[PDB]
Amino acid sequence: TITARHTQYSHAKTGGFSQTGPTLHNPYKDDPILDRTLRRLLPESEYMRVAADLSKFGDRITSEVEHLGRQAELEQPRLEHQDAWGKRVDKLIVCNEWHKLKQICAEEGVISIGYEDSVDPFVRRIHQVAKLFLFSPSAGLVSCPMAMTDGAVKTLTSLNLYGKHKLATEAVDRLRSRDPSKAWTSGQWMTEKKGGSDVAGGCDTYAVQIDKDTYRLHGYKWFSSAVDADVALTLARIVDSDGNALEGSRGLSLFLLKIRDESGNLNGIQMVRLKNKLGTKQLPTAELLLDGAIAERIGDQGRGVAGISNMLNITRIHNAVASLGYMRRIISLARDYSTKRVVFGQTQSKWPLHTTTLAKMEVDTRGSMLLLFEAARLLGLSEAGKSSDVEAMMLRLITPVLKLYAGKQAVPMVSEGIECFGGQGYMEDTGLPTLLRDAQVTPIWEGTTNVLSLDVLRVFSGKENILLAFGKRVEQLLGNTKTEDEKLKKSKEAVESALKQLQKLLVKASDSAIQGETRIDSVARHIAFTIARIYSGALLIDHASDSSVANQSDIEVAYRYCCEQPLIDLRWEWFASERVKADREIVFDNFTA
Amino acid sequence: TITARHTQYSHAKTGGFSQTGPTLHNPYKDDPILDRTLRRLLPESEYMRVAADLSKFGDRITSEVEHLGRQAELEQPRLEHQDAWGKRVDKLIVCNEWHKLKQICAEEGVISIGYEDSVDPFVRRIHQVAKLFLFSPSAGLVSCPMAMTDGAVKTLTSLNLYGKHKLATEAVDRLRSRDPSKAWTSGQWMTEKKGGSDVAGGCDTYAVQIDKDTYRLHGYKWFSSAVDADVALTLARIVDSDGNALEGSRGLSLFLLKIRDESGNLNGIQMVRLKNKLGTKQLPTAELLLDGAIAERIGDQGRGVAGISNMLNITRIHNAVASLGYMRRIISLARDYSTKRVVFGQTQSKWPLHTTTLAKMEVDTRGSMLLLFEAARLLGLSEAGKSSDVEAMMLRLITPVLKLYAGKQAVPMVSEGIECFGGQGYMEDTGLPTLLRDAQVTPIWEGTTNVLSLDVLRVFSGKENILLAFGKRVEQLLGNTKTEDEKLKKSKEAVESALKQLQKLLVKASDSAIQGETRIDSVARHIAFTIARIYSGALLIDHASDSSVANQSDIEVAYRYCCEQPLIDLRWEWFASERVKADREIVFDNFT
Amino acid sequence: TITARHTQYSHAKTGGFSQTGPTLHNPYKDDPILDRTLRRLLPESEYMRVAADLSKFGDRITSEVEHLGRQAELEQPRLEHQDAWGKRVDKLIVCNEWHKLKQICAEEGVISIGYEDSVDPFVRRIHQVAKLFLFSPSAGLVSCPMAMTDGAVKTLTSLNLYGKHKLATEAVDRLRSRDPSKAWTSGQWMTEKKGGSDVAGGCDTYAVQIDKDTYRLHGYKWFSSAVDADVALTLARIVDSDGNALEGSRGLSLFLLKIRDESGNLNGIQMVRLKNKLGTKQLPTAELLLDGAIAERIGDQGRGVAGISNMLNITRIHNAVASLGYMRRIISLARDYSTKRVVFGQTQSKWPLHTTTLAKMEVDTRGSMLLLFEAARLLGLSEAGKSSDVEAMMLRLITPVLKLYAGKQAVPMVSEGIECFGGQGYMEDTGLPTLLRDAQVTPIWEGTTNVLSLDVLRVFSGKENILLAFGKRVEQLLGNTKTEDEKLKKSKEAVESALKQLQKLLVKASDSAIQGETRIDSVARHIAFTIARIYSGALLIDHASDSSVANQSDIEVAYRYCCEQPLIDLRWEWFASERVKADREIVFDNFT
Ligand SMILES: Cc1cc2nc3c(=O)[nH]c(=O)nc-3n(C[C@H](O)[C@H](O)[C@H](O)COP(=O)(O)OP(=O)(O)OC[C@H]3O[C@@H](n4cnc5c(N)ncnc54)[C@H](O)[C@@H]3O)c2cc1C
Ligand SMILES: Cc1cc2nc3c(=O)[nH]c(=O)nc-3n(C[C@H](O)[C@H](O)[C@H](O)COP(=O)(O)OP(=O)(O)OC[C@H]3O[C@@H](n4cnc5c(N)ncnc54)[C@H](O)[C@@H]3O)c2cc1C
Ligand SMILES: Cc1cc2nc3c(=O)[nH]c(=O)nc-3n(C[C@H](O)[C@H](O)[C@H](O)COP(=O)(O)OP(=O)(O)OC[C@H]3O[C@@H](n4cnc5c(N)ncnc54)[C@H](O)[C@@H]3O)c2cc1C
């Protein structure tokens, strides 16, 4: 009979308060412009169908995909070179959610949709891009094999192999399949140690003929993402019968291989290690040593870079989607959080300074958003055989410009976004820093900002009059400006003036370069930034002029995008070659030689 | 007898090539502007002493500290609530290299130099900040307790407690010590669940009087870094004899406590958990449950906020140091890499696009670097009693401005830097991403960009003196311009034009009728950025114009900073209340 | 044009050789004695049903479960106190394969089979234990909640609560279900800091009446496994209306609770931490702080201990299953390996020393295996109402004996087994060490070897009936001996001689004068081992003597078990009180 001690067992008191975090709303319904943009680009019959599918998928993002993608971050891939008995197996361990995510992509047709023969090509790419844009920031980086997979189908089909070449026909069918138990994905192994940007100088993989169009590959692939994929595309240097190869782009042939034989065993490949990455941690990225890998030559010998170009538009568009996804997502989470976090006696949402900051992020995102859907429209026209000459040229211009500009927007924007949450933004267990770490891949891979900026110049250097064509496209967009609204008129005038300046500078540049004292490369980024802003601005304007869909916000946005920041930031003197000498004196001041 | 099988055992061949990564060079010698800046600011005999100490420390950084900081990232702090036998212990497990870093801070006087009696305060804060600046990007986040440590010293001293108050006097003395065996660090525990930033409205810790000036604390600290520190400052509401307290700022009193007791046992504190952080992973940051932690009140009752205000200038300066450290570091690594990485047949260093990219990063860095040293200058003066009115006012203005601007430059700059490395910049095992993850703390803690922008507005609202003095300071800097140089001249004009326009807009927004339709808080960031750019611009001109040290890069950077990006980005129509409504519509379009 | 470099990219060569590891064969078909034992014990039509179900499950074990169990070791449970936003949640993170294992338990009726109304209880517990035995070494410790689950069913039923008590009836029904979507598991939270084993003196949990039969619990559970269960049984002291309670066994009442509420939220419970365990790493074991956990009292007030006593037989049987599972498993793997590993020019299987080592392990395993099935037999009989006096008494005696003996055989046996593999037996990635680390739980939990040895003594002290009945049971087994066989005959004699000597020593120790100078607790283990060996011996003889099933190995094993190691290791002089003094001196020599 002692005194009871119930009182001596008691949970810790912590004050009662804890902050409610942000809510992810249905990302199709909650998106500011996506639905409206679709109202305008698609025909009525197709809009209903597409909206319904996307809106439903929105609900799957919130109830299922988000959680899956999160788990893929929490349970990262591993590699075991060996089993326990001394046997080399290169076992890749990836979590169930990654696999489930690949299956949802199949079921949801994230690839299929972009190729469905019963649907108009222009419709389907716009549907697909909208779907990828809902998926991407919840994807746990399954978005990356989706991109390479789309790019693979694209490449194999542009080379006219589907129906004719055994493995490519099978690949195409499987890569496009909506059957989760049949569907394939693809990798893409271009980057090597000596160069990634530079494939003609970097690639030291060699192909020895076994028989006919079947070769052995031997080389080292320095980044190879999604090694759980079923097939891959890669470049290599065919070895002629005297044991020799060609340097440069002219040495490179293109090959398709199955990653694993029918026994589940690696096909002449050893995984040297998995990368330890700032972000995309969900994604297994390996270094590969090829040593006898059996592969099939596709496309013409020495025509390897040409072969894979066929997919540029694709991959880059997907990359842009990712960038934009991160941007939209942080805004979406931020603004929601803004209705719940009390500071100095009211919700963040009430403080002018807070809304100013977010509004500017909105403005910039909308611009690029519409640039993205222009790209998707254009790709689709091109795939239908219905491109005007101008639309064909715009497709070639817009893709690198889009990838690099959205690319460069993304980290600063997402960085600003997480700061909206204060300290919480910085805590990995909220899910928010993932968005930053993963966003930062987007300006780096598939071409850095500056390498793509050169690609933009190389688009110009090819020469049907890209620039004139750029001019006409802009003019079309400006032609139905609601000039009666004072702000849209001013906007139209800003875009117009900027276009006119850019033309003048590039005309000037083009003349002066034989004289030696002019280096257009040096300002390639500013050039590419300018095109993006002009193009994006024109689209916002056209968008805000459709009063069947436009609201007031659309008008404010067009105005702010066009007139409250420079459309062109580019000066003649930055072209001067002397400028380059000044550049290096600055950079290399006191550098220890 | 059998055929040998030496051929069957063979390492893998992987092609012979692998890329040389970047070299970290002596960061005092390699820095493009730090030596020249010190040359101008210090009298020659102090410069010589200071340079030699830093040059040497540069070597210690490449030979030792860098590696130490890297290891503190590779071996992150852990926390164990219980020992194995049911005992609550809260064991904080932190790697040896963290500890070693703390001792190097003592050995190298990273705190001491700033308070050395026998050196002039001017000299000494310049020297200190320079040293803090070399240290910071190699510190594995030991930079953070150093900041909190310096702030603690400043706070304790400014309250006139040295000599009088036993614990604060022991604290000051140990926080400043060069003896690794004795030196102390401090934490600072303000932030709680309901508010960081907003401490007046978010602080829900309570202090019950034990005897005279000794209290027990009960509350929950939501972020508390360097829980391996020895002392900490913190705020709490004293509970009266009806068992009641005061809401708002007026309730809060400031307290000093020892973290652990003579026994190594936590003083009424539990560690609930360590934070899982994007960056500053080296640094142990915990949540703390205070339940009878024994603490000495310092400063006056209900004057807790004022009390810790004395340390702002210093904390903020340290923060800016961090930002700039990352900026300088990435540029330094990248430039080096650029002489080693071949792309299309040449090293990156020969591609104009690549150096265009870098030059612009350099330009912006230098502007802020000088801004940093002007703050250091102004702080040292303040502490010597020699400040003019102008200079006293500039210390108040520059500190929040500097922190927020450098803070907001840092992530986009470091992001661009890691992109110079291509895919390798994205690999954690290079050490490069750490720079970015760690840089991202800087615009967030100790006030977000926008919160500090509001502070900037408080500094000058509605006190016309502050901006006129900014005016005067700018003119002092510009009056030295080598106007013979066309670029410096245009530069000067640009600064003039911008300063003017700024002053006009703020006068106009001050108009007591204009105000109904006018929200200046809305553009607080633009305002603060403009101040930043104008100040920094002017400082770059002054620097370029000193012929005893400047070179041609100096002129060129000054020209670019001032004339090739707007110094003022601020329009009258952005002050309109109506605009706010438009902002909201844009932001909450389709919001569900 | 350049010279190709295909020769410069080449995998490493490592000599061509690597050892084939062991194969897990269908563990029902491969088992040397399980099928024959079932053949003898079950009527043919039940055997046929049972074998087919097990044979099939054998395949499911090699094709699926094994891999699942391995994964539950590779992906250990984790616990998160807080979510990211300051909320206390106690999230238990356990791998998919654990969950999958639990569903296979439901699908395969690992609990259901033991309670199936339409099958005879005799049959069904034999079938169940057989199934438990195939499952156990592949279960990734899901075996543990299965034991606690079966014990819960038995307890709830034996208290005559099925039909009457709402929660217990729902519980019983869900614990027995084959529907993965509905099936439940149970925990059992007895052990506290002051005592496991000693619950009467160590339980410091308190139950305050809410209403009628519903109470709130406040206390600290020091070990609580399978916190992913749905319900749990536990003991606590009811607090009276003076706010007082009863020390000792009499205070304790037994309670039934739901672990989480309709919302998935813990019922007044926090998880303080998960244990870091030598083995059973698959299994989530936590320490629990009960603070207002809502619970239904079941059984009578102060009858908590009696209440849970009904489940001992069953829990103990499950434990022995585990021990034997590990023993069988290692032997099975090792023998296989032995047909694949060449040492000095032959497979290990051809080296007599190697097979001598294994034979002795086999001999001992089989003895205990039969002991296990005799327990199963006796349990099923008890539950059918058909037990003779002898058989009722043998159930009580055999259960602690079986658990402790198998428990003490297991680590040294599995240790010898892993040594058969040489260095590979010491490698975690083979899966083999898991066997040893997991086996080591078995002599420790649910009573240590010595604590259960004291229970064995309680079973028979001072109740002369129990040993006479052991006597009778042994004679029943021996009366069937094929005495025509010289080995079985000698065997029989050995058992006789030993049983006799045992009975004499215990009579002698019972002498009320002898007792002053006599400590029987001192030799409790020897006593219990002797009972074990005698019982098992006799069972091996009986088995060997059934010509319809036995083979020559059976005879030989029986002979070796009985005649090649002492069945009794127990001398009269070890009972002496004086001896105790000598024991202490030896043990505490130079103790400081
Ligand atoms: C790694 C780390 C370690 C830390 N360590 C410590 C430590 O040791 N000690 C300590 O005291 N603190 C520490 N902190 C606290 C840090 O200072 C806070 O996180 C900071 O106050 C940011 O605010 P918050 O976290 O309370 O978020 P909140 O202030 O809730 O939200 C910030 C957001 O609200 C906005 N906002 C707030 N007020 C206004 C306004 N009036 N007008 C417009 N917008 C507004 C901001 O602009 C920002 O977007 C740490 C933080 C981090 C990330
Ligand atoms: C997470 C991740 C996953 C990846 N997965 C894959 C994959 O599955 N398959 C694959 O093939 N690749 C993959 N990559 C590789 C990626 O495409 C390369 O990183 C990219 O090609 C850049 O190449 P690099 O890393 O060699 O950069 P480098 O080109 O060595 O360096 C880039 C820097 O050099 C500058 N530069 C380069 N050329 C020029 C020039 N001509 N003029 C001026 N400046 C120039 C760039 O602007 C940039 O600053 C991956 C990368 C990452 C980060
Ligand atoms: C992995 C694991 C999980 C567990 N999970 C649970 C669970 O879910 N629920 C639960 O209730 N319990 C659980 N237990 C508790 C387990 O039954 C106890 O650990 C057990 O009671 C052993 O005793 P103890 O831990 O209290 O040690 P103690 O009993 O303090 O010490 C045991 C030692 O004392 C000796 N000893 C004790 N009494 C005597 C005596 N009278 N004479 C001579 N020697 C004596 C024993 O022989 C032994 O040497 C778990 C244990 C483990 C290891």
From Swiss-Prot, chain A:
The keyword Glycosyltransferase does not apply. Residues 1-29 are annotated as: Disordered. Its EC number is 1.3.99.-. Disruption phenotype: Temperature-sensitive mutants in which embryos develop to adulthood at 15 and 20 degrees Celsius, but have a poor survival incidence at 25 degrees Celsius. Mutants have increased membrane fluidity and abnormal compositions of fatty acid species. Changing residue 437 to H: In n5876; suppresses the defects in egg-laying and response to reoxygenation of paqr-2 mutants. SUPFAM superfamilies: Acyl-CoA dehydrogenase C-terminal domain-like, Acyl-CoA dehydrogenase NM domain-like. Keywords: FAD, Fatty acid metabolism, Flavoprotein, Lipid metabolism, Nucleotide-binding, Oxidoreductase. The keyword DNA damage does not apply. InterPro entries: ACDH-11_C, Acyl-CoA_dehydrogenase-like, Acyl-CoA_Oxase/DH_mid-dom, AcylCo_DH-like_C, AcylCo_DH/oxidase_C, AcylCoA_DH/oxidase_NM_dom_sf, AidB, AidB_N. Pfam families: ACDH-11_C, Acyl-CoA_dh_1, Acyl-CoA_dh_M, AidB_N. Residues 5-23 have a biased composition (Polar residues). This is Acyl-CoA dehydrogenase family member 11. It comes from Caenorhabditis elegans. The lineage of its organism: Eukaryota, Metazoa, Ecdysozoa, Nematoda, Chromadorea.
